[PDB]
Structures are given as structure tokens and as C-alpha cells.
Point group: C7
Chain length 29, copies 7
């Protein structure tokens, strides 16, 4: 369904934030 597919896009975006934040920790190290 359209609602469940949108919620899965929100999850994917949050995983991209996690990856971006791991780039920061790398950058600090």
C-alpha cells in the first residue's frame, strides 16, 4: 500500500542520515 511504501521511504532516508553521521565520526578520527 501507498502508506506502508511511504513509511519504508522514511526508514530508508533515516538509514542515509545514519550513514552521513558515520562519515562525521570517520572525519573526526
Amino acid at each position: 500500500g501507498e502508506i506502508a511504501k511511504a513509511l519504508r521511504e522514511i526508514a530508508k532516508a533515516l538509514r542515509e542520515i545514519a550513514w552521513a553521521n558515520r562519515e562525521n565520526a570517520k572525519a573526526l578520527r
Copy 2:
């Protein structure tokens, strides 16, 4: 539907946050 469209709007805004957070990592690199 209106609800699905608004949730996809939320996903897009979270992709904007991901891009901004990566620029923070790159500014610490430079």
C-alpha cells in the same frame, strides 16, 4: 492519497537532513 503524499514529503525532508549532515562531515575534512 493526502496522507501518503505527506509521508513522502517527510521522507524527502529526511533526505535533505542526510545531505546537510554529510556536508558537516566534509567541512570537518576541510
Copy 3:
């Protein structure tokens, strides 16, 4: 509808977080 309208405010608030985070990246760049 009231639920869709509130979801679109959530998206707008996330866009404001992205803007703030972009401001950080600029401040780090100096």
C-alpha cells in the same frame, strides 16, 4: 484533512532542521 496537514507540518519542521544543519556546515567551513 487534519492528519495530512499535521504530517505536512512535520515535513516542514524537518526542512528547518536541514536548513539549520546546512548553517552548521557553513560555520565549520569558516
Copy 4:
């Protein structure tokens, strides 16, 4: 409705995060 009201409360909390994050940018610029 109680769901819409709770979603608006989420949006307000996200606006608080945006203000906090901008203050991090202001504290880096000093």
C-alpha cells in the same frame, strides 16, 4: 482530534531541534 494534536506536538518538537541546531552553528561562529 487526539492523533492530529499529537502529530502537531511532534512538529513543534522538531522545530525545537531546528532551533537547537542553529544555536550550535551560532556557537561555532562565536
Copy 5:
């Protein structure tokens, strides 16, 4: 309702993130 109650805990958790992020801005000033 159980859904609205859960959404209000989401909002409360987000206000805790804002508070944590305001602590960061204070640590940077220091």
C-alpha cells in the same frame, strides 16, 4: 488512545533530543 499516547512519547523523545542538542551548543560556547 494507544496510538495518540505513543505519538506523544515520540514528541517527548524529540524534545529530549532538542535539550541534548542545546547542551552541545552550550559546550561549544564554553
Copy 6:
């Protein structure tokens, strides 16, 4: 219900992010 428990799961994860973010502030001091 399954939806409400999942939303409570989201709130707890956000409480983990608040703790982590505060640790970042503690590591600056």
C-alpha cells in the same frame, strides 16, 4: 496493538539518540 507498539519502539530509539547527542556535548567539555 502492533501499530502502537511500533510507535513506542520509535520513541525509545529517539530516546537513544538523545542520550548519544548528550554524550557528544560531554565529550566537548
Copy 7:
């Protein structure tokens, strides 16, 4: 249900942000 599963995927992605942010605090220390 598909909606509850997608909400649980959102919670898992937020836990992945928390882990990133905990790592970021260790990299500052």
C-alpha cells in the same frame, strides 16, 4: 501488518542513527 512492519523499520533506522552518534562521541573523546 505492512504498516506496523514499516514503523519497526523506522525504529531500526533510528537505532542505527543512535549507534552512529554514540560512535561520534567516542571519536571526540
